[PDB]
Design a protein around this nucleic acid. Structure first.
Length: 110
DNA sequence: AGCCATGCACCG
DNA sequence: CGGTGCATGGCT
């Protein structure tokens, strides 16, 4: 089977996602559908490569939130400013199949 | 019902 | 006392 880019989901950056804290909140449904299942709040390192070949390492983890969870990527600040993104800009998460290799890209708000 | 943007306590 | 880890509240 030939390689194919398959889009997974996107996140429109909030002020919190794009600012000094360096944590991006992932939509819960998307994180649970498409990223690796994680059982422990601490999470796992997650490697995601962009079209310019840069491989970014995030920590994919969650926060307990009432009896539920919020999922986040920690360590996103180098990625966000290397791409000149701000609040309102969009990050796209995709996969290369077969393989399931995670990739990403972004676009500026209209 | 409960996501998710952001507030905020407290631990080191 | 700055950041981590979670709480709180706007919103649908």
């Amino acid at each position: 089977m030939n390689l194919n880019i398959v889009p997974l989901f996107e996140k429109t950056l909030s002020a919190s996602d794009a600012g000094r804290i360096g944590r991006l909140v992932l939509p819960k449904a998307c994180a649970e559908a498409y990223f690796p299942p994680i059982s422990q709040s601490e999470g796992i390192p997650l490697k995601i490569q962009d079209v310019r070949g840069r491989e970014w390492t995030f920590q994919f983890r969650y926060w307990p939130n009432n009896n539920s969870r919020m999922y986040v990527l920690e360590g996103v600040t180098p990625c966000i400013q290397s791409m000149m993104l701000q609040a309102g800009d969009t990050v796209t998460f995709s996969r290369v199949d077969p393989g399931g290799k995670l990739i990403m890209g972004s676009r500026k708000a209209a």
